[PDB]
Amino acid sequence: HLTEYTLQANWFDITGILWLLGQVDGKIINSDVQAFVLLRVALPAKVEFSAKLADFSGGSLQLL
Amino acid sequence: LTEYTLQANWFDITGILWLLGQVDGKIINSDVQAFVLLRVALPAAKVAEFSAKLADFSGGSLQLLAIE
Amino acid sequence: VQLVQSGAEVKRPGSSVTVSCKASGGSFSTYALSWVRQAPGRGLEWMGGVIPLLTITNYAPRFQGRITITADRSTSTAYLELNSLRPEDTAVYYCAREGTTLGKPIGAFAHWGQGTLVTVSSLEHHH
Amino acid sequence: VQLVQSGAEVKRPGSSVTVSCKASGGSFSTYALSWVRQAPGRGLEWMGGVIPLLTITNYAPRFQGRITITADRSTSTAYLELNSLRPEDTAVYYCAREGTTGAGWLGKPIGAFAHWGQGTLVTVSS
Amino acid sequence: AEIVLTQSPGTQSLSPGERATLSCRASQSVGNNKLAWYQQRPGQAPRLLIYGASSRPSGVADRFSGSGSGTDFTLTISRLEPEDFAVYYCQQYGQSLSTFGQGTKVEVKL
Amino acid sequence: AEIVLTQSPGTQSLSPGERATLSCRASQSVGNNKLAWYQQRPGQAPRLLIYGASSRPSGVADRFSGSGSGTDFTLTISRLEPEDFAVYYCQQYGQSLSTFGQGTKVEVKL
């Protein structure tokens, strides 16, 4: 069949994503909007933190 | 003191602050951003082509994530 | 691609106005259509937009609450609702559609409506 | 952790009201304080909140543009400013702060609201 | 999106001692099981019973228990006391826009 | 955040044939160099000159050239023509919240 992925973009990129999606026989199954808080953090490489972050979020939080 | 960025729902932020305390960490900067979330469907054969162009189109920011 | 807006509007404070933006040529559903305003002798100001295909709207925080943007895919017309007008809201309102290179969209606004002037005044002489 | 809110208030359509919420007990800056309201006979409704330390606000879209939530770290006090009052805004407004895991005020933040003000009735009448 | 939380039953009547089973169902999966239950007695402020879908906070009697995940949640009052007769609310805070259910009223049967 | 775009000079005068170099400074780094430049003549709607910081659409003369990245952008008009005497706007669209600068006015040196 067709496989499903998620994607996060700012509003001004969505239509480009849609155009590219069409060029590869793709479809949009769902859309939604969400506000997030972006944090810039400063810790020593205790970088423990990621493990506790994982427990705290059930795998969904990603340190970048 | 290495730096990273972190994206989270608002109700999780204070919890992040708290965890940071147990690594002597600090919040450098904060911002608020709205994003559109897409759930897309395409054939397995096209995922690479899509993912590649998606990186070129987004200057390497956009990341296609799998649904488990 | 050409965009044609509704005619001038003169309104009393604390009321509503609806401007329409009719698109012709190209495809309407898959390209982002925005609204920008310009108060007399002042700068361009992005208010928000709509991606018709997904009925996904994006408002500037300055305008959320007082603003509703819609697109009607059957008539290729976008709409701007201003509520609780205030004298400050007097300005030219432009609809703008992103350009392309069924081309690939660029975000930047290549196509613009002629504009619609909304005058908000308690001056009974105006209406 | 006590939260005490300003007294009842009676306002006119188009006007504005500010409701104060003062915390006493434990730390204040590191916990998410929210405002929740309840129209007469109706359900609870989350309006928005602030995390004082970071000055980060979060409003529910319905009220985005009409609402300003601020915090005053000096006095341990949150405020709710609601503008362009309409008669559908008539309700009791409660301030609500997230609890912490375990007894003692210094636990882990839980997000859910364990601490509530007595509430503040705002009547909008023509 | 504005996740809609539907509570059922709307109103139900029970006797002291009986077991209460309250349902709250989400229009979308709820982020990291962040669902809370509150009790509101007449004229009081709400009171937190459960958070994280199933965790009990400091001071809440053992007769209150929460379960479920994803879109289907349940509050269970193992044995109703006189004060348990109240309106109960679920809330999701697993995204930045939190929302409440419309509430279930548990009244005295007779 | 609301990225502030400071354009300079605010106003300035030049003669036909001269080179005009306009600056747009951004309070934060602009995502994926998503920055556009518009020209607006009196009584007219804006016209797009540059997008993506340095890309020119078809039908825009090669005398307009855009450059810059991060937080400092420049629109250069290699030799001004009578038509070019107008107001010019920079715009960032590298996040959901787009913002315009206040505009630079190019008047006739007189």
Q: Supply B12's token pair.
A: 């999780």
Tokens of A25: 């026989």
Which chains pack against B, by 3+ Cβ pairs within 8 A?
A, D, E, F
Chains with 3+ CB–CB pairs under 8 A to A are: B, C, D, E, F
Q: Is F1 on the interface with A (CB under 8 A)?
A: no
User: CA-to-CA distance for A7 and F82, rounded, in angstroms?
Assistant: 47
Nearest CA to F91 out of A21, A8, C108 is that of C108
Q: Which residues of A34-64 are buried (b: 16+ CB within 10 A; e: fewer)?
A: bbbbebebebeeeeebeeebeebbeeebbbe
B62 touches chain D (CB under 8 A): no
Instruction: For tokens 């017309």, name the residue.
Output: C77
Residues in chain D within 8 Å Cβ distance of E47: 116
Give the tokens for residue B37: 């979330």
Please tell me the distance from the alpha carbon of residue E30 to that of residue E28, in angstroms, as a whole number.
Answer: 6
Token pair 């994607």 is found at A7
Distance from chain centroid for Cα F110: 23
**Across the interface, do D56 and A35 touch by the CB < 8 Å criterion?**
no
The residues, any chain, with a CB within 8 Å of residue D114's CB and separated by 6 or more, are D1, D97, D98, D99, D100, E48, E57, E58
Beta-sheet pairing, F87-92 with F99-100: antiparallel
Give me the domain span that covers residue D25: 1-126
Query: What single DSSP character describes residue E82?
Result: G
Phi, psi of B35 (to 5 degrees): -135, 150
Instruction: Tell me the pairing of strands C67-72 and C56-59.
Output: unpaired
| Strand ranges inside chain E, DSSP E | 5-8, 11-14, 20-26, 35-40, 47-50, 64-69, 72-77, 87-92, 99-100, 104-108
- Residues D35, D56 contacting (CB under 8 angstroms): no
Helix (H, G, I), strand (E, B) or coil at B45: helix
Q: Give the technique used to solve this structure.
A: X-ray
Q: Two tokens at F34?
A: 């998503």
What type of residue is E100?
A: F
Type and span of the H or E element at A16: helix A11-23
**Which of D106, D64, A58, E97 lies closest to B10, judged by CA?**
E97
Q: Break chain F down into helix, strand, coil percent, rounded to 5.
A: 5, 45, 45
F33 touches B: beta carbon within 8 Å: yes
**Tokens for F16?**
């036909």
Taking CA atoms, D50 is separated from A7, A57, D97, in Å, by: 28, 21, 10
Can you tell me whether residue E27 is helix, strand or coil? Answer: coil
Going by the DSSP 8-state scheme, the letter that residue C114 receives in this structure is -
Tell the residue number behind the tokens 């300079």, with chain if given. Answer: F8
Q: Do D64 and C61 touch (CB under 8 A)?
A: yes
Residue (of F25, F101, F108, F20) closest to F64 by Cα position? F20
CB atoms near residue B57 (< 10 Å): 18
- With tokens 């059922």, the residue in question is E8
Q: Which of E31, E32, E96 sits opposite A35 (nearest CB)?
A: E96
Q: How far apart are CA D59 and CA F46, in angstroms?
A: 34
CATH label of the domain that carries residue D27: 2.60.40.10
Q: Which residues from E are below 8 Å from D103, CB to CB?
A: 58
How far is it, in rounded angstroms, from Cα D27 to Cα F94? Answer: 38
Query: DSSP for F60-76?
Result: S-TTEEEEEETTEEEEE
Using a CB-CB cut-off of 8 Å, the residues of chain B touching F93 are none
Alpha-carbon distances, residue E42 vs B14, E46, F82 (angstroms): 32, 10, 75
Rounded Cα distance, F19 and F78, in Å: 5
- Nearest CA to D3 out of D113, D100, D84 is that of D113
B48: domain CATH number?
3.30.70.240
> Of C20, C119, C116, C125, nearest to C76 (Cα)?
C20
| Residues E104 and E5: beta-carbon distance below 8 Å | no
How many structural domains comprise chain D?
Answer: 1
From CA F95, how far away is CA B58, in angstroms rounded? 12
Domains detected in chain F: 1-110 (2.60.40.10)
The residue among F108, F25, F39, F110 whose CA lies nearest residue F71 is: F25
Spatial distance between the Cα atoms of E86 and F21, rounded to a whole number of angstroms: 70
- Closest partner residue to A36 (CB to CB) among E1, E33, E96 is E96
Cα separation, D31 vs C35, whole angstroms = 38
Domains identified in chain B, total number = 1
List the structure tokens of F89.
């706007």
Structure tokens at F35: 């920055």
Residue B30 contacts residue A38 (beta carbons within 8 Å): yes
Domain span at residue B23 reads 1-68
Nearest to C109 by CA among F45, F43, F67: F45
Neighbours of D104 (CB within 10 A): 9
* CA pair distance D24, D92, nearest whole angstrom: 21
Read off the tokens for C93: 């309102």
Q: How far apart are CA C38 and CA C41, in angstroms?
A: 8
Residues of E in contact with D116 (CB under 8 A): 45-47
Residues 6+ apart with CB under 8 A from D16: D81, D82, D83, D84, D85
